[PDB]
Amino acid sequence: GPVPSRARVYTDVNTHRPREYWDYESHVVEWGNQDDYQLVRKLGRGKYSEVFEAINITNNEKVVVKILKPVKKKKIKREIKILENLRGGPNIITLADIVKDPVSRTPALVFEHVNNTDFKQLYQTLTDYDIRFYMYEILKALDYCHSMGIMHRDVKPHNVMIDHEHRKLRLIDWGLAEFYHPGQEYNVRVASRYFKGPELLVDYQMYDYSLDMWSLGCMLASMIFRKEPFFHGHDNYDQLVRIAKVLGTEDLYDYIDKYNIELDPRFNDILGRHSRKRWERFVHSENQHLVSPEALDFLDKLLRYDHQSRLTAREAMEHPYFYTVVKD
Numbered sequence: 370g371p372v373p374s375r376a377r378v379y380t381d382v383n384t385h386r387p388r389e390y391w392d393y394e395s396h397v398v399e400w401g402n403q404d405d406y407q408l409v410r411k412l413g414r415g416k417y418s419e420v421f422e423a424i425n426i427t428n429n430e431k432v433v434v435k436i437l438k439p440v441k442k443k444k445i446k447r448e449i450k451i452l453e454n455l456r457g458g459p460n461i462i463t464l465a466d467i468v469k470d471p472v473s474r475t476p477a478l479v480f481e482h483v484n485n486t487d488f489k490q491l492y493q494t495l496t497d498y499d500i501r502f503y504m505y506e507i508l509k510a511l512d513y514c515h516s517m518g519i520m521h522r523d524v525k526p527h528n529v530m531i532d533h534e535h536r537k538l539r540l541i542d543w544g545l546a547e548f549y550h551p552g553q554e555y556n557v558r559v560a561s562r563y564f565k566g567p568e569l570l571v572d573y574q575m576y577d578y579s580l581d582m583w584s585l586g587c588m589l590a591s592m593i594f595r596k597e598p599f600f601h602g603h604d605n606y607d608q609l610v611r612i613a614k615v616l617g618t619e620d621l622y623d624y625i626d627k628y629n630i631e632l633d634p635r636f637n638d639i640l641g642r643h644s645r646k647r648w649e650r651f652v653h654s655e656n657q658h659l660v661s662p663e664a665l666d667f668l669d670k671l672l673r674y675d676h677q678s679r680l681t682a683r684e685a686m687e688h689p690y691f692y693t694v695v696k697d
């Protein structure tokens with residue numbers, strides 16, 4: 370069988386927390402008053418929810434309301450429990466309330482409002498200094514949630530809300546987040562395709578917080594190299610092939626051999642043989658202002674096949690790439 374794996378940090382956080390902390394199936398929701406909130410405009414829709422701008426009429430403050438579509442109550446309680454556990458943490462979106470929507474007959478989560486710019490437009494604009502600053506702010510959120518025993522499992526640009534005017538950042542959309550427990554096998558159908566870690570793409574279920582660090586590396590690569598998304602696969606199989614054309618096939622085989630993993634035989638006709646590339650090949654005159662030796666070294670240490678070899682969020686915050694960021 371496959372070789373087991375443990376997180377190298379925050380391994381036992383939930384072990385020594387009280388059961389109530391991570392036992393979300395037993396959580397009892399504290400419902401607020403649904404008539405406190407007036408919906409203003411729809412902001413988005415997905416398979417599992419719709420999101421709205423709204424006004425809290427008890428204080429005339431803007432909020433954001435996510436009205437769930439029907440989904441297992443276990444997963445609704447999981448997201449609620451995680452948001453309450455993380456509330457107040459650095460750059461974590463604040464859950465302000467939970468109400469029952471009378472039309473949907475489902476829960477509606479009420480969040481603080483961020484005056485956001487779309488990443489497609491914001492990313493055409495950020496400077497080298499901006500990218501370092503906001504990467505540091507994301508790391509604060511990720512080290513916090515990892516230190517609290519939670520993996521996000523859907524890190525991607527669409528889930529990082531930035532109010533550039535106030536240099537304010539919030540990590541949102543905790544609907545896929547999970548509690549880390551040593552030895553637990555997790556669903557690999559998480560994260561967006563372009564941000565899926567190799568562990569998901571080879572069906573290794575005993576993964577951990579380090580998944581979020583791969584996803585963050587994909588974001589960093591897209592920003593400093595001006596290629597969004599960086600690994601642009603047409604499906605989950607091609608996604609691994611795109612990664613292997615950069616990291617090389619020999620280290621992919623080292624990875625699956627370490628964990629006694631077997632590749633899907635459908636890769637026999639599509640994977641090929643690929644050397645590992647040097648990151649300098651992705652530098653050109655239109656992105657070199659965003660690239661430095663420090664950026665390439667930092668990126669290189671996030672994008673490792675072996676989830677046990679990636680920088681932790683705390684280690685990443687120690688990296689020389691962040692030396693120029695003003696610390697508060």
Ligand SMILES: COc1ccc(/C=C2\S/C(=N\c3cccc(O)c3)NC2=O)cc1O
Nearest residue numbers: 413414415418419420433481482483541542
């Ligand atoms: C404009 O400011 C904000 C925007 C979003 C949030 C929080 C969200 S949105 C989400 N999930 C989605 C995303 C897209 C479509 C959809 O139907 C559901 N999960 C969250 O926590 C908070 C804000 O302050």
